[PDB]
Amino acid sequence: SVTGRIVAMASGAGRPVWGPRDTVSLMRTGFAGNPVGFRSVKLIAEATAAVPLICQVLDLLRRPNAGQGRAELFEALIGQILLSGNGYLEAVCPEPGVPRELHVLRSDRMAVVPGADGWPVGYDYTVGGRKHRFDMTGHPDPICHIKSFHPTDDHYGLSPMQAAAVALDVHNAASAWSKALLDNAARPSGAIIYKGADGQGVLAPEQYERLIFEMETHHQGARNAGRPMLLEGGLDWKPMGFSPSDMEFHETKAAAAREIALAFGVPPMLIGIPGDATYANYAEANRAFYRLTVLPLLTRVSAALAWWLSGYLGAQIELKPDLDQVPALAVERDQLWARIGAAGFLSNSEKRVLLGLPPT
Amino acid sequence: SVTGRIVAMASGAGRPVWGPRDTVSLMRTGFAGNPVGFRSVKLIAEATAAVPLICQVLDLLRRPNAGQGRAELFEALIGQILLSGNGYLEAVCPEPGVPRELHVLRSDRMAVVPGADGWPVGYDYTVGGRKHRFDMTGHPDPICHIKSFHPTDDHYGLSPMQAAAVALDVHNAASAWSKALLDNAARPSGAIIYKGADGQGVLAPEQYERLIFEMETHHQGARNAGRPMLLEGGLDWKPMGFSPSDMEFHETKAAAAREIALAFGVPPMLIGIPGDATYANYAEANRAFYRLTVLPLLTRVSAALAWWLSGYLGAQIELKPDLDQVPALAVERDQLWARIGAAGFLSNSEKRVLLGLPPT
Amino acid sequence: AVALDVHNAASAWSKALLDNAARPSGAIIYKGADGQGVLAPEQYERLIFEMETHHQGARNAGRPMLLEGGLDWKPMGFSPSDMEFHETKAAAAREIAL
Amino acid sequence: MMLNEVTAVPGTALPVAEFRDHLDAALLSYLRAAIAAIEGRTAKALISRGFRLALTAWRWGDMQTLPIAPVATVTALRLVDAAGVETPVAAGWRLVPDMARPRIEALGAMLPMIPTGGRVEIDFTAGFGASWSALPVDLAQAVFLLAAQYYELRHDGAAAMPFGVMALIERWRTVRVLGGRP
Amino acid sequence: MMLNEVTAVPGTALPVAEFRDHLDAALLSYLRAAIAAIEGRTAKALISRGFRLALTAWRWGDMQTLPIAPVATVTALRLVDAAGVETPVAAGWRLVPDMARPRIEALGAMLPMIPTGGRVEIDFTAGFGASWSALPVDLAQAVFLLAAQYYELRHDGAAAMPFGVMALIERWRTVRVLGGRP
Amino acid sequence: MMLNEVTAVPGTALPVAEFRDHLDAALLSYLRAAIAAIEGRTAKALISRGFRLALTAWRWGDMQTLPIAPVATVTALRLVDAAGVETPVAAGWRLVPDMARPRIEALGAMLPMIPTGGRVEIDFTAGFGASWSALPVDLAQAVFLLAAQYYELRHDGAAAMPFGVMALIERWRTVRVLGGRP
């Protein structure tokens, strides 16, 4: 905090330090552009929104605003923390306490103003040509800013897409390579070379209509595959090929698809990347998914929500995921019960407390 | 909501902000065009409509309108949320409370008018040249707009087909490549080169009818495979080949088919894409299907229906999927019963409550 | 000490192979009317434009590239692509751990 | 795309005296038989006549480069109808004077839309100069090296100097590497 | 990109006397027919005339190297508008005098932005020297070896000495290995 | 990198008498047309004139080898500014006299930093000797074998002796095997 005095002014005191930028270009060619980046964010965002949260805020969280609900709020929120590394949550509060509505303002239309020392003084929602200038000089601080870990930036976070920015281009360009290879590529099945009496000479239109007819009727099609094609003097048929047919940037596009899923943290088994079986049977692939890139991301967003909403209600509320009621950790849930259930040295009163059950 | 004042006018106050467009071009060449995109939507839409919904609306949902039923309503509804990312549900209501009919208006013939601040003021159903201008300045708000998560758009959703828009073209064009390769391709089994006494010279019609006869009768067909074909002076037979025969854009079409299924979220085992076995025996492939792309999609549409229909009846109704009566989660259902059934430290009264059974 | 040098040098071999290596996808050979002759700047700007706009990129993979008299396109390759000192660097990594 | 010229070179501009000094109705007959041969291989004009590129459909919406290379001051861009309305439009395009791609692009929009059946005809003044003294002297020497050959041998008999007829016009030909869609 | 010269070489600068001694209206006609042939193969100027590179769009923002190689003292960089405003700008660029890449780069920023349709025209004085005695003598010998050939044979007939016309100008041609995007 | 010489060879140093004995305004015209041809193939100077290597950016920080090979006694290393400050610096470099890589390296540090736009110009005296009697006699014989050829045939006609013009200057050419970055 003490260094906040010298870093804020050196970054621009009281002036909008906008986002790293391109935060909207990559959203179109990295999310709405390719299926791997689309399915990766969609897989993480809907899984994070589906995990129940416990309250050691609810009524508000279940029904955030008149539009999106609890599911769509977290999806649209995590969908920003993944696409840009920044998550903003506006709260309007006509009456003191739990604010009425929570809105997920899109992160590419939002800039931070560092202010005087350290912590920002406000936020600027800039759509079109107009701003709004939220205010951070209060106790509620209506904007909650969830940042992914950024090592070199001081006011924003890092997007996992930014790391995979090259793999998304390799995947987009190799997919457009195969498509363009089909749209503009002249593959002839042969050629009727007609040199003529001279070294070079065309054939009259009376000979063209005859030749174009005997080729269309008798030598083209599936029903004409093998006609011996008498070639007179001067005429010739050179059968042409198509040397590279399959697999144009096939593995370099597959390796690129694996590096996009690698950056976002999803195991390639879940989204469907064809590749080596690192996990066995989706029992561990889903368990590793919810353990390495879903709950660690949720335990941060939920922790930021709790500390921000507890600034409105007069309490220091805690809000963590409910690791019990998740179907992805059932493989871990039962092996715990098997260890403590088969343990007879302690009585039933002791193991009910070990497994999280209220004693009887 | 506060930023809704500046974003609505900057997007056009009170004017129809039509759909992203192409929402009808891709429906013809991505759903009615190829089997992978057709089977993917059809698989998700009929599975989502088959899941029972619980009411912690029914009579209405089971018999929506005089035409389509509960099954066809959700299929035609999810079939739009998948094809365009937008789902509209019109409700006509002669008497107060539960509206008589629910209609799924196709999303490419519907546009949103943002209005003054934030939330829209109506919707425009534009068929042919005529509009209707629904009205959103009421409590019932007759149109329920289900949107898939769109990060950069403010009034619509994102279609999983839009992400796979290139993979659908690669699949369509590579399939039309193989078809056109069969319709117009001159494959001769040989050629009878007749140079003649000169460097070049045709053979008289008296020699053509003789040659065309001895080739048809004695040298063509399956019953004539090997005739030694005496070649006189000047005549010659050049056996021609067909170098690339199989597998023209074979793997690039297969990889494209896998990326369409990847975007829609179906495991390639279910629809039938030949590829690596990421899942084992359809017990986990179907369970992962209903867990990653069916129930997460249903728990949003059902949640939007509940909050919209509860605006008609005087209650805040909840409407969620019935995860018990689904055959796809039986593999997960029994492993729960095995863990709590084999747990003897707690009595039968405790485990009946743990498994969701009313005690006795 | 030697396995560390083989591992360091083979890793710097792959890196330097990417930093300074001219891989062209082809070449537009223009001999001309003579045995050798350049093409005027009016023909260069035209040729540099039709190649950039219509024949380069992923969206331009297959354009049939009409070649007039004198012009020619020689598609060039890249013969050793993968695995430059691949196993000798892997065997070196195994001898360091050994 | 027709590209039929309006008025030919009168002949008082062709260098019959200079050609005669290089070595008159026959001399004039071989000068233009060598100009047409060279300007057909290089797609040039060399005397700045007036042409009429009367085509029916634009290849692009910001294009339709002109076939004859050295162009200056497109006179009119007429839009006839199916009956021949012959209405001259005056705005919507601009000539980009280039020796490589002499094109008539646009004014920030599409070309003047062509009536169905109502071909567009463009008339321009394409060439190097009005008098022979304005040509690139290497292209003028190539016309002489060719015309003096047509004059010295009357039928197709046989004989490659360092800078011959070919090596002199090899730098005026059009270099194209597209036989594709755009 | 037009690059049409302003004023030709008057002829009082070309060495008609020295060419005659090497072996007059015909001699002058073969000297310039050999200068144009050699300066079209080497992209040089050799007499330092005045040119006008009137292009419409910069290829870079710190570039637009000039086609003619030996350049000195760009006179003006005019920016016309769509109507021909002909406003001369005076700052924002600098000529980097090189025999390899004669370029007019920048002043720490982009080139003077070109008005839409308002082509930029640059006029410069490119060449070796104003008098024939300033040329590289090997390039001057190549002009003589070629002009003396145009003089001794009038039509394209056939006959490679150690340092011929080609071996002398082979070191003045432009060496380029880019047919790509940048 | 310009490398335009300051003063040419006056001609009183070229061996017009010895060339005439080997076989005068024409003889002098073929001697220098053969010196320029040979010193352009070997990148030598042969008469030790004065040059001006006026470049804009060093290729290294301890380098900028000079193009002309036989160099001695770089006179000055001027650093102009954007306006032409023409301030001569006197320390910071040293010429390494080599026939292979005649370079002006450094004094234990970087070259004198070049002002932005303020090109550096170096003037040196590169060559074998001031008089013709100081040349390597095999390079002097090559000039005679070439000049005597330019004299005996005036246009590019055709005729490889054991030690010809090529075999004599093949050991004075620059041997380079780098077309890369450094």
Residue numbers in the entry:
A (entry chain A), B (entry chain A): 24 to 79, 90 to 393
C (entry chain A): 198 to 295
D (entry chain B), E (entry chain B), F (entry chain B): 1 to 23, 36 to 171, 175 to 197
What does the paper say about this structure?
Gene transfer agents (GTAs) are DNA-containing phage-like particles produced by some species of bacteria and archaea. The genes encoding proteins that form Rhodobacter capsulatus GTA particles (RcGTA) are derived from phage DNA, which has been integrated into the bacterial genome. Here, we use cryo-electron microscopy (cryo-EM) to determine the structures of RcGTA before and after DNA ejection, and to visualize the interactions of RcGTA with R. capsulatus cells. Particles of RcGTA have heads with a diameter of 38-nm and 49-nm long tails.
